[PDB]
Amino acid sequence: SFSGYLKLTDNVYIKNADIVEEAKKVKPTVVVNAANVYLKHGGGVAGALNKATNNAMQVESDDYIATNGPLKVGGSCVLSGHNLAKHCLHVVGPNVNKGEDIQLLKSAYENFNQHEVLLAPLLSAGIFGADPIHSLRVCVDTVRTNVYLAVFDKNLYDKLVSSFL
Numbered sequence: 001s002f003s004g005y006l007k008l009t010d011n012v013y014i015k016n017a018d019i020v021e022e023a024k025k026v027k028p029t030v031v032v033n034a035a036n037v038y039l040k041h042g043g044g045v046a047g048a049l050n051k052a053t054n055n056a057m058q059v060e061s062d063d064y065i066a067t068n069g070p071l072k073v074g075g076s077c078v079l080s081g082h083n084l085a086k087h088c089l090h091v092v093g094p095n096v097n098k099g100e101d102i103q104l105l106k107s108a109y110e111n112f113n114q115h116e117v118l119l120a121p122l123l124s125a126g127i128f129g130a131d132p133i134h135s136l137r138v139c140v141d142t143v144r145t146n147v148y149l150a151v152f153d154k155n156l157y158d159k160l161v162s163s164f165l
C-alpha cells in the first residue's frame with residue numbers, strides 16, 4: 001500500500017515523491033493525471049506519466065479525443081492506467097498561465113470524489129501556474145475520498161506541510 005505519507009486530514013495524505021515512481025511502486029487503482037482538455041501529455045505530470053507508459057497513454061488519449069472531442073476545464077475522463085495504475089483519471093485543472101479560470105479548481109477536485117482511493121498530484125500546481133498552497137486547501141475542502149498526494153518538489157512539499165492550516 002501507500003507508505004511514508006504524512007496525514008493532513010481524515011482523508012488527505014501527502015508525500016514528497018515523484019508520482020511516476022510512486023505509481024510504479026504502488027500500482028494504485030487510480031492515478032490522477034494533471035491533464036489539459038486535449039489530453040496532450042507534453043510536460044509536467046502529464047508528460048512524465050505518458051513517458052512512463054512509453055507513449056501508450058498518448059496513443060490511447062488521441063483515440064479518446066478523436067471519438068469524444070475535448071474535455072471541459074474542470075472535467076475528467078477515466079482511461080487505462082497502463083503500467084502505472086488500473087485506471088488513470090485525467091483531470092483538467094484550470095491553467096492560470098494559459099489564462100484559464102482559477103474558480104474551476106473546485107470543480108476539477110470534485111472528480112476525485114467518484115473514486116474511493118487515488119494517487120494524485122496537486123491540481124493546477126506546477127506548470128499550470130496556480131498557487132500550490134491554494135490547490136492543497138481546495139483539495140482538503142473538496143475531496144471526501146482518500147487522496148494520496150505526491151508532490152515532486154521537496155522545497156514545495158516542505159512549504160506545503162509547514163504552512164498547512
Ligand SMILES: Nc1nnc2ccccn12
Nearest residue numbers: 018019020044045048152
Ligand atoms: N517524473 C516527473 N518529471 N517531471 C515531473 C513533474 C511532476 C511530477 C513528476 N514529474
